[PDB]
Amino acid sequence: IDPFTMGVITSESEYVSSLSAEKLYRGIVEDGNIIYPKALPRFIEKAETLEGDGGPGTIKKLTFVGDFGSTKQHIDMVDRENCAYTYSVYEGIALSDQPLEKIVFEFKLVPTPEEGCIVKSTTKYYTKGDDIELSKDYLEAGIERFEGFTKAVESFLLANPDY
Amino acid sequence: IDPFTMGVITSESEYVSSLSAEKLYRGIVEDGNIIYPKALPRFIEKAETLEGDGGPGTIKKLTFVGDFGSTKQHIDMVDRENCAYTYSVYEGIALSDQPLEKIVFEFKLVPTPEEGCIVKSTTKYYTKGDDIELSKDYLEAGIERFEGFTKAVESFLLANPDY
Ligand SMILES: C/C(=C\CNc1ncnc2[nH]cnc12)CO
Ligand SMILES: C/C(=C\CNc1ncnc2[nH]cnc12)CO
Ligand code: NA
Ligand code: NA
Ligand code: NA
Ligand code: NA
Ligand code: NA
Ligand code: NA
């Protein structure tokens, strides 16, 4: 009479970077705490590690510039060899008319022959409740924001090879 | 031996709109609750009035798309005749190394002969503490965000004369 229901809504976006997979990956994953505020000086005030050594299970916190609060990232998968990174957000993620259980952010960087890379981004929204309503603008906002972080880092690193 | 100290840091920006002062003012001030999400579908989820009839003393709340929280605006001055609007934000405004007492946002729209208007924006940061440290990127972030709201509304209204 009463099923358990869950939706998983996946959005995929790609773009081609002229920066190498290795460099972009290091920028975001290893050196993020320094690079995020430098790349996004008007959006990210601070990026810090609250728990863990940087591997799976690590908890990071981004604090945003202005009255936009802060958010924790819970690191799931860290694969330097394959330039792959996954983390989850658990809090402050509800819409007005759709609660969410979590949002998962995944990127994979794939080298191209030109020695740039394809940046493969994914966002996955996991729904809470017995039904589902998610708008195009929302679903787009999330993957654009995420891909926009990566793009900002790429631009900073091209501009500043030593940081 | 111990003074009371406060800083008031004022940032002023202008730009010229092709939309009339009257129309832009109505869009933001009178019709904001409908227009903000329509103009900024990927940033503002909802804009609502919590208390008051829209005049001075009114409290509005913007809810942001994604994990960026929400913020209350406390309406101070509402002058339709002069297309002027002022409100304050009190919460979620600290920097990591500088508490703030409040941020005041003011705009004045001045008709030009072309029947567009000059949009005069001001942000005022009121400091909390016995000393002061505020960076250029921060001070810029605030007035750019604010002027960016107004610009988004201007673009939506030019594109949609009936909403
Ligand atoms: C980025 C910063 C402020 C921007 N926030 C706002 N800017 C303009 N209007 C508002 N209403 C509520 N919050 C805002 C830094 O102070
Ligand atoms: C606009 C939306 C999400 C964007 N937020 C994030 N996007 C990418 N990485 C993150 N880390 C913490 N929060 C984020 C809507 O889900
Ligand atoms: Na902040
Ligand atoms: Na948050
Ligand atoms: Na469910
Ligand atoms: Na939100
Ligand atoms: Na807020
Ligand atoms: Na003081």
Domains defined along chain B, listed by start: 1-163 (3.30.530.20)
CB-proximal residues (5 Å) to ion ligand 5: A 5-6
- Helix, strand, coil in percent for chain A, rounding step 5: 25, 40, 35
Cβ pair B103, B123 in contact under 8 A: yes
**At CB < 8 Å, which residues of chain B contact A?**
41-43, 45-46, 63-69, 71, 89, 91-93, 95-96, 103, 137-138, 140-142, 144-145
Looking at residue B111, its amino acid is P
The H or E element that residue A47 is part of is strand A44-51
Sequence-ordered alpha helix ranges (H) in chain B: 21-25, 32-39, 136-159
Ligand 2 within 6 A of CB of A149: yes
If you search the block for the tokens 């589902």, which residue do you land on? A132
CA A77 centroid distance within chain: 12
What is the dihedral sign for C-alpha B1, B4, B8, B9?
A: positive
- Ligand minimally distant from the alpha carbon of residue B150: 1
Largest Cα–Cα separation, chain A: 61
CA-based nearest residue to A159, from A18, A55, A62: A18
Check if A152 has its Cβ closer than 6 Å to any atom of ligand 2. no
- Measure CA B29 to chain center: 10
Contacts of B3 (CB under 8 A, 6+ apart): none
Instruction: Please give the backbone phi and psi of residue B22, each rounded to the nearest 5 degrees, phi first.
Output: -55, -50
**CA–CA dist A1, B53 (Å, integer):** 47
Contacts of residue B120, Cβ cutoff 8 Å, sequence gap at least 6: B12, B14, B107, B108, B109, B110
Nearest to B67 among A41, A66, A89 (CB): A89
Q: Which amino acid is at A134?
A: L
Interface mutation target, options B40, B48, B62, B68, chain A, most CBs of A under 10 Å:
B68
Is B36 part of any known ligand binding site? Answer: no
Q: How does DSSP classify residue A112?
A: -
With CA atoms as reference, report the closest residue to A125 among A117, A136, A116, A115. Answer: A136
How far apart (Å, rounded) are the C-alpha atoms in residues B151 and B15?
9
Nearest ligand 1 atom to alpha carbon A65:
1
Residue nearest to atom 6 of ligand 1 (CA): B146
Residue A97 CA neighbour count, 13 Å, CB half: 8
Question: Are A12 and A120 a contacting pair, CB within 8 Å?
Answer: yes
Final resolution, Å: 1.9
Q: Residue B57: how many CB atoms within 10 A of its CB?
A: 12
d(CA A116, CA A23): 10
N-to-C CA span, chain B = 59
Residues B38 and B163 sit within 8 Å (Cβ to Cβ): yes
Beta bridge partners of B89: B103
Cα–Cα distance between A133 and B66 in angstroms, integer?
A: 15
Nearest-ligand number for the alpha carbon of B7? 8
The Cα-based distances of B148 to A3, A61, A110, B14, B145 in angstroms read 46, 26, 35, 11, 5
List the determination method.
X-ray
